Write a structure and sequence with these properties.
The complex is a heterodimer. In chain A, 0% of the residues lie in helices and 50% in strands. Chain A is an all-beta fold. Chain A has two domains: 117 residues, Immunoglobulins (Immunoglobulin-like, Sandwich), CATH 2.60.40.10; 87 residues, Immunoglobulin-like. Chain A starts with a strand and ends with a strand. Chain B has two domains: 102 residues, Immunoglobulin-like (Sandwich); 93 residues, Immunoglobulins (Immunoglobulin-like, Sandwich), CATH 2.60.40.10. In chain B, the strands form four sheets. In chain B, strands 1, 3, 4, 5, 8, 9 and 10 form a seven-stranded mixed β-sheet that branches. In chain B, strands 11, 12, 15, 16 and 17 form a five-stranded antiparallel β-sheet that branches. Classes of the chains: A mainly beta, B mainly beta.
C-alpha cells in the first residue's frame, strides 16, 4: 500500500478539479479511502471518504461541492471539487482510513499518499524568463545568481554547471508577485575564477522547459 | 462542524518533556477515538497515535498520548531534533466518515544560537531592463531565530508598492532564509540615485544598496 494522487497541478477559478487515487496494494472492497487536503498555512482538512460498499461521507461544510466515487475494477477512487476558488489551492492527499462504530465512532488514517499540490489561479502554465544576477556593483568574493521570473505553476528546479557546482549554492523559495506569477532566485558565492564559467540550469517541468543561462562573474 | 483546538506553537530544548493539547466537545474528542499525526518539513503526514493511546508501528516510544474528557494530549517525553514538525489531532464526529482535524501545532526545537542575516541585493539585469522591467532581489540567509523584516528605500524614502516579501523558511543547516522582490518599471529604476534593502533582525539592521548609475 502506498496510494498515489494524479491530476492537474493547476486549474482555473469556477472550474472543477478532478483527482484520481491509485498505486494500491490491496482491494477497495477491503478498505475505505479518504481524501485530506492542506491549504498553505492551514491545518489538514477532511474532505470525505468512500467505504468498501461505496457509501460516502463528506465534510459537511464542503459537501455541496464534493464528489467521491470509485471503481473496484481499476482500484481507483476519484475526487471532484466543483466551483473552485483560490481557497481550494492545497496539497491533496489520498488515504486509507479506519472507519468503524456507549456508541462511539472510530476514525484514523492508516496510510497516506505523497500528496499532489494543486493551485487554483487565473494564471495558466507559463515558462519562466531567466535573468543573470550579479552583486558586483553593490570585495574579493562576488555573488552571482539567476532570477527565475514570472512562471506558473510551481515547481522550478535550479542547478549550476549541470550539477558540478554545489558548494555555496543557495536556491530560495518562491514569491507570488502582484502579476499572479511566481519568481524565485538562486545564488552562488564564488571565492574567485578568471576564466571559470558559471551557468544556471533551470527546469520548469509543467511547461516542459529547461533553460541554461550563462552568468558573467567578472567584477 | 466541530473544532479541535490546539496551541499554535510549542517549543523546547533537546531532551525536554513537551505536551500538545487537543480540546474538542463531547461529540468528538469526548467520544474517545482520537488520533495524532506528524508532518515533518516537505513530507506527507505520518500517523503517530490512534484510538486515543495506541502508537503506530515504527513510532518511537518517547511519543505517548491520553485523554481526559474533551481534551486529548500528546506528550513527547524527550524532545529530539527530528521532532521539529507540525502536529495534528483528529476525531470522528457523529459518523466514522466525518473526520475533524485539529487546528495544528508547530513544534520548534530550541538550541541554535542567534545568527544575523547575510544579505545580498541584486540590481535588475540589463536583459530585464530591455523589457521595460526592473526587479531588485534581496536575498536573506543564515539567520536565527527565523524572523526578519524588510524595508525598501529609494533615495532614503520608503517604498511599499510592488514589494513581495517571503516569510522565513528553514535551511538545511537549521538557520533560516527569506527573500524580497521590488518590481519597478525600467524608468523608475533609472530615475533614482540609490535603492536600499534594509533587513531588520531582532532590532539590528543590515542594509544593502545599489545605485543605478553604477549598476
Amino acid at each position: 500500500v502506498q496510494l498515489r494522487e494524479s491530476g492537474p497541478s493547476l486549474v482555473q477559478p469556477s472550474q472543477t478539479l478532478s483527482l484520481t487515487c491509485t498505486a494500491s496494494g490491496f482491494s477497495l472492497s477491503d478498505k475505505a479511502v479518504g481524501w485530506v487536503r492542506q491549504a498553505p498555512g492551514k491545518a489538514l482538512e477532511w474532505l470525505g471518504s468512500i467505504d468498501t460498499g461505496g457509501s460516502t461521507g463528506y465534510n459537511p461544510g464542503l459537501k455541496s461541492r464534493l464528489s467521491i466515487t470509485k471503481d473496484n475494477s481499476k482500484s481507483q477512487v476519484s475526487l471532484s471539487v466543483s466551483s473552485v476558488t483560490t481557497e481550494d489551492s492545497a496539497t491533496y492527499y489520498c488515504t486509507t482510513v479506519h472507519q468503524e462504530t456507549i456508541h462511539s465512532y472510530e476514525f484514523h488514517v492508516d496510510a497516506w499518499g505523497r500528496g499532489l499540490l494543486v493551485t487554483v489561479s487565473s494564471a495558466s502554465t507559463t515558462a519562466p524568463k531567466v535573468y543573470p544576477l550579479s552583486s558586483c556593483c553593490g570585495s574579493s568574493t562576488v555573488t552571482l545568481g539567476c532570477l527565475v521570473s514570472s512562471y506558473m505553476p510551481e515547481p522550478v528546479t535550479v542547478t549550476w554547471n549541470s550539477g558540478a557546482l554545489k558548494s555555496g549554492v543557495h536556491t530560495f523559495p518562491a514569491v507570488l508577485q502582484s502579476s499572479g506569477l511566481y519568481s524565485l532566485s538562486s545564488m552562488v558565492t564564488v571565492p574567485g575564477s578568471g576564466t571559470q564559467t558559471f551557468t544556471c540550469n533551470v527546469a520548469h517541468p509543467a511547461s516542459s522547459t529547461k533553460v541554461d543561462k550563462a552568468v558573467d562573474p567578472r567584477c | 462542524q466541530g473544532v479541535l483546538t490546539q496551541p499554535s506553537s510549542v517549543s523546547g530544548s533537546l531532551g525536554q518533556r513537551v505536551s500538545i493539547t487537543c480540546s474538542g466537545s463531547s461529540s468528538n474528542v469526548g467520544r474517545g477515538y482520537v488520533s495524532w499525526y506528524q508532518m515533518t518539513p516537505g513530507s506527507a503526514p505520518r500517523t503517530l497515535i490512534y484510538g486515543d493511546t495506541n502508537r503506530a508501528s515504527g513510532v518511537p516510544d518517547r511519543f505517548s498520548a491520553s485523554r481526559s474528557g474533551n481534551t486529548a494530549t500528546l506528550t513527547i517525553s524527550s524532545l529530539q531534533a527530528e521532532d521539529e514538525a507540525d502536529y495534528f489531532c483528529a476525531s470522528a464526529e457523529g459518523s466514522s466518515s466525518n473526520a475533524v482535524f485539529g487546528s495544528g501545532t508547530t513544534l520548534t526545537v530550541l538550541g541554535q544560537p542567534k545568527s544575523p542575516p547575510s544579505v545580498t541585493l541584486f540590481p535588475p539585469s540589463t536583459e530585464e531592463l530591455n523589457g521595460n522591467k526592473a526587479t531588485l532581489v534581496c536575498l536573506i540567509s543564515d539567520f536565527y531565530p527565523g524572523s526578519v523584516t524588510v524595508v525598501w528605500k529609494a533615495d532614503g524614502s520608503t517604498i511599499t508598492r510592488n514589494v513581495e516579501t517571503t516569510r522565513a523558511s528553514k535551511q538545511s543547516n537549521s538557520k533560516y532564509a527569506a527573500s524580497s522582490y521590488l518590481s519597478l518599471t525600467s524608468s523608475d529604476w533609472k530615475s533614482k540615485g540609490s535603492y536600499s534593502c534594509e533587513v531588520t533582525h531582532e532590532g539590528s539592521t543590515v542594509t544593502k544598496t545599489v545605485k543605478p548609475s553604477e549598476c
